[PDB]
Amino acid sequence: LAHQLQQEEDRKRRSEESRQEIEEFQKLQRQYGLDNSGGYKQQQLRNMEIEVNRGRMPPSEFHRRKADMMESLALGFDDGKTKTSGIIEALHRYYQNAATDVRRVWLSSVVDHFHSSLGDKGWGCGYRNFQMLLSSLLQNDAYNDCLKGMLIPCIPKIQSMIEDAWKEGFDPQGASQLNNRLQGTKAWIGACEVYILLTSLRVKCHIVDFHKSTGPLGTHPRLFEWILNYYSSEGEGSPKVVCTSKPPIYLQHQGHSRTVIGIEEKKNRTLCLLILDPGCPSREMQKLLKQDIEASSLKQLRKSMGNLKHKQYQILAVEGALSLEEKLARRQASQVFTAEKIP
Amino acid sequence: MQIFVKTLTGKTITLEVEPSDTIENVKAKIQDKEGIPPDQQRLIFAGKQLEDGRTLSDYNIQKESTLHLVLRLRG
Ligand SMILES: [N+]
Ligand SMILES: [N+]
């Protein structure tokens, strides 16, 4: 009797615990894109079917878009429908010609913005950031040999390319964290995946891990100072606006990533990062294209230390090209995967 | 008491813990069995990411509870 009383309560507790665990696991696997419920192709189609069902899109047009999607996916090429070009050149014009609170501003080289489409909304950030970074490398002659013949890949192709890096032997522990597969999924990725992808293409790059806050009020001054150092040059005759040859910086925090395309040193000596978000729709990006930039729009691009209070950031920065021997050295190093840590 | 720690690929381990264990201590115990540094771990239970300086006590973790383990920094 006594034993039965204990056994029954335990059973009931266990069952409730199990139900809770199962429900949570499901929610998390789904959020992280690891529940094996399908990929980009599926989401695009499902979301376009909503657009038909809601009466917002003709059924014929669904067939045309689907056709075009399938061609792009077969080729492995992004279709460009979420791309906005000319932001660097527009910022250069603005900073040169407009009365600002800026002493000096450093910009990365030409960079195309990519936002998520219907296919990757909610999960494509890391991939879209990779596309922005790559757009800059593809216009930079330093990377012509390593990246020869490449166009911006579509998200499914990026997933394939990561898998290829895993197959070569990069970062097996990272592969195992994502079930060794990315195609046909909505998997969140991080700087570690972007790293092995670029390394596998013979691009020299590295991660820096800002693993805890370094300033008052949970700020990350070290991060701002690292980016200033990356963008800036020692001195001499540097102009107020410097459009550098440097690629932009991939910026990860838990849950989301963005692309840093420059940094402003205000007249009061504080620093402000210029950040593109792959969540920003084309109509918002277009505002930066008009000759006089709204105050809200500029404010949206500008991030001060108060705006970066996540516990941990990682950056990935690109530094040049690798020899095959240097790539193989990095492939072996990636077996015990580490990054520079600050502090 | 025993608890379980499960990654989002379904890999599961058991840990021996006390209610007074900090989340920091639990991440150490995971490192002890899997070699994963604590800075790479995020633990979630009942919808909440668990904070380092709090105890299992603080979160009503019971024997045979499962914590979910998110690895590295992704988004
Ligand atoms: N979209
Ligand atoms: N995104």
Q: What are the residue boundaries of the structural domains of chain A, listed by start?
A: 83-341
Q: What is the resolution of this structure in A?
A: 1.7
Closest approach of chain B CAs to the CA of A209, in angstroms?
A: 10
Task: Quote the strand ranges of chain A, DSSP E.
Answer: 83-84, 102-107, 113-114, 203-210, 241-243, 249-253, 256-266, 271-276, 302-303, 313-321, 340-342
Give A147 Cα–ligand 1 centroid separation in angstroms.
Answer: 28
CB atoms within 10 A of CB A307: 11
Q: How far apart are CA B35 and CA B27, in angstroms?
A: 10
Give A253 Cα–ligand 1 centroid separation in angstroms.
Answer: 22
Give A118 Cα–ligand 1 centroid separation in angstroms.
Answer: 5
Q: How far apart are CA A261 and CA A249, in angstroms?
A: 7
Q: Does A33 touch chain B (CB under 8 A)?
A: no
Closest approach of chain A CAs to the CA of B41, in angstroms?
A: 11
Question: Is A154 a known active-site residue?
Answer: no
Q: Does A43 touch chain B (CB under 8 A)?
A: no
- Three-class SS state of B5: strand
Type of residue numbered B20? S
Contact indicator for B33, B15 with CB cutoff of 8 Å: yes
Candidates B7, B10, B75; nearest CB to A254: B75
The active-site residue, picked from A125, A154, A192, A205, is A125
CA A67 vs. chain centroid, Å, equals 28
Q: What is the CA radius of gyration of chain A?
A: 23
Q: How far apart are CA A36 and CA A23, in angstroms?
A: 16
* DSSP character string of A190-217: BHHHHHHHHHHTTEEEEEEEE-S--SGG
Is the Cβ pair B72, A190 closer than 8 Å? yes
Candidates A21, A192, A252; nearest CB to B66: A21
Question: Is A125 a known active-site residue?
Answer: yes
Q: How far apart are CA A237 and CA A77, in angstroms?
A: 42
- Three-class SS state of A31: helix
Is the C-beta atom of A48 inside 6 A of ligand 2? no
Which residue of chain A comes nearest to B48, CA vs CA?
A24
For residue B47, give Cα distances in angstroms to A20, A236, B39. Answer: 10, 54, 20
Bridge partners, residue A77, by sequence: A153
Ligand nearest the Cα atom of residue A276: 2
Give A2 Cα–ligand 1 centroid separation in angstroms.
Answer: 62
Question: Is A277 a known active-site residue?
Answer: yes
* DSSP character string of A305-340: GGG---S-EEEEEEEEE--HHHHHHHHHHTTS---E
Which residue of chain A comes nearest to B63, CA vs CA?
A14
Indicate which residue's Cα is closest to atom 1 of ligand 1: A117
Q: How far apart are CA A154 and CA A76, in angstroms?
A: 6
Token pair in block for residue A36:
């094996």
Q: How far apart are CA A210 and CA A302, in angstroms?
A: 20
Query: Nearest 5°: CA angle at A92, between A86 and A96?
Result: 150
CB atoms within 10 A of CB A244: 15
Q: How far apart are CA B73 and CA A209, in angstroms?
A: 10
Give me the architecture of the A83-341 domain, per CATH. Answer: Alpha-Beta Complex (3.90)
Bridge partners, residue A272, by sequence: A264
Checking A214-218 for CB contacts under 8 A at 24+ apart, the result is A214/A342, A214/A343, A215/A305, A217/A306, A217/A309, A218/A309
Closest approach of chain A CAs to the CA of B36, in angstroms?
A: 10
Q: How far apart are CA A95 and CA A91, in angstroms?
A: 6
- φ/ψ region of A222 (left if φ > 0, alpha if ψ in -120 to 50, else beta) reads alpha
- φ/ψ region of A152 (left if φ > 0, alpha if ψ in -120 to 50, else beta) reads beta
Ligand nearest the Cα atom of residue A126: 2
Q: How far apart are CA B27 and CA B69, in angstroms?
A: 10
Candidates A28, A29, A312; nearest CB to B73: A312
Method used to solve the structure: X-ray
Bridge partners, residue B6, by sequence: B12, B68
Q: How far apart are CA A191 and CA A252, in angstroms?
A: 7
Q: How far apart are CA A127 and CA A250, in angstroms?
A: 11
